[PDB]
Symmetry: D2
Subunit: 115 residues, 4 copies
Amino acid sequence: CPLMVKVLDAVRGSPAINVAMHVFRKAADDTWEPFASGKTSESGELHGLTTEEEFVEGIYKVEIDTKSYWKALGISPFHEHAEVVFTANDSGPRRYTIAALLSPYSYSTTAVVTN
Amino acid sequence: CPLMVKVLDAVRGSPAINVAMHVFRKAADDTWEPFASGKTSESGELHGLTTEEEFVEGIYKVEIDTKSYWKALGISPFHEHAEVVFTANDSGPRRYTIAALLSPYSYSTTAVVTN
Amino acid sequence: CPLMVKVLDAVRGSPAINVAMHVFRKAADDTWEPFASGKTSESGELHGLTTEEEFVEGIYKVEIDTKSYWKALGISPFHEHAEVVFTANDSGPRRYTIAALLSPYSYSTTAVVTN
Amino acid sequence: CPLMVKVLDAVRGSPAINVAMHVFRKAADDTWEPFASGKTSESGELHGLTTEEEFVEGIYKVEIDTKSYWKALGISPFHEHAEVVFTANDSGPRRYTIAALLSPYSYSTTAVVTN
């Protein structure tokens, strides 16, 4: 499992559950092609988006639907989504854990990259 | 002006100076239409991006070129750039300060919205 | 003045107004000696805490009463307060802006140090 | 395991390994009494600090020695340490995961509290 995304709710101090996200990969013609998608579990984690073989070198974008998350909780947030755009595997295969920490008017994203 | 961006460097403890960014407005065909850009001053701030009359309701994107900033400092970054996407003015005109706090493998974006 | 504190509210997307804080300097017996305090203005800023002549080298602590802030908004917070502890002026006099970004179950503190 | 602390390095995008921390509990006479201590593992996690039985209601402080971490990597950071001060178990036993995200001039702390 070379790509994992974890999402936390900084208002409730809890995992952000059932958060939808879509992953895209930049194609040769410079457009965003749909790569993978899923929803966070009860632990706020989304595993199994891709495989070592499929997750080749490229520029990837993860668009996390934070607006729907907040709206469902009664909140009109600032951001439409939280985005992570990154070049992956440019020095060989790596494991990526993307952490998103959510507040109604602020988010942070962090990457932990391991061998 | 109704939009200001401030950028800070969490490695050096300083304003992030000469950081380039482009501002886009989502078009009817939902492509992104560029409409403003600039680079942060010596105080890490970018003002004068738009005016009250131009800054109408819509979905806006600020694309901050964080990668080039880290490149210039000789530090390996994770993200291609830092994309702040938000619906503007949804209630009516507001003043927006977008604050971006940068680290090589993490960033946060916060909005301060005043009326 | 050589020390300024700015506080932002990540739930409301606003300056955090009327946030109380105390500043301490570590004494010889390594107890904390209070020496300044105040509350954030309507811009979320607290200025005039000290002067260039008073702000000598040493270890300083800013104790931000985040709990009372969240209490006043009717929101359950995690932390008792947000303690910024730093060695000042270690090279010589600097100007410090401490920026605190607050959520109920998360906070970040960043220093902008200029010379 | 009712208390866990995880520490990440936002410069390298990696767990922050061998980071020392000390936990204190506020006594009846309002002083800080030593409660527990340890170092983060290769995963940047510190488990086993306490037990359900021992971890009674109280005000707890975790002081994470971030300065030694950065110094060992050649960096003179802003903060002396990262602190987490919180009331625990005031509504019955809870599980606490404290996440610290470290940069030389900035840190964030987040709590995930579960049943």
